[PDB]
Design a protein around this ligand. Structure first.
Ligand SMILES: *[C@@H]1O[C@H](CO)[C@@H](O)[C@H](O)[C@H]1NC(C)=O
Ligand SMILES: *[C@@H]1O[C@H](CO)[C@@H](O)[C@H](O)[C@H]1NC(C)=O
Lengths: 50, 50
């Protein structure tokens, strides 16, 4: 699961087998770290029209 | 069922009969109109190429 974003700890409680989390419109918004099983939120790196 | 357009009313017309209202009701009627969309803008490079 390659991507670019800001990673933080999160209040999400994945079931033991679940590895990734998705928003309403398929976009990935969380992941489980594979070496210590914390659930990380993903949000896009900040952007906007100049 | 075949739908009904409204109740029938044979108006009491004759060449020398008039109906005049003896009282009134002030009616307050709500009318609702759209005026503006949500203002979208899209970075078409970030949408297409990620
Ligand atoms: C991964 O290895 C480290 C060092 O041995 C250990 O602290 C950690 O608990 C291990 N995690 C898993 C999910 O096995
Ligand atoms: C007119 O209508 C009101 C209620 O809307 C009623 O109280 C009043 O007595 C009526 N007046 C007449 C002259 O019928």
């Amino acid at each position: 699961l390659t991507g670019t974003g800001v990673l933080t700890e999160s209040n999400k409680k994945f079931l033991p087998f679940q590895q990734f989390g998705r928003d309403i419109a398929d976009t990935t918004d969380a992941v489980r770290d594979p070496q210590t099983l914390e659930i990380l939120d993903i949000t896009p790196c900040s952007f906007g029209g100049v | 069922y075949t739908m009904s357009l409204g109740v029938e009313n044979s108006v009491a017309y004759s060449n020398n009969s008039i109906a005049i209202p003896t009282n009134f009701t002030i009616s307050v009627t709500t009318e609702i109109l759209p005026v503006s969309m949500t203002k979208t803008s899209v970075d078409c490079t970030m949408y297409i190429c990620g």
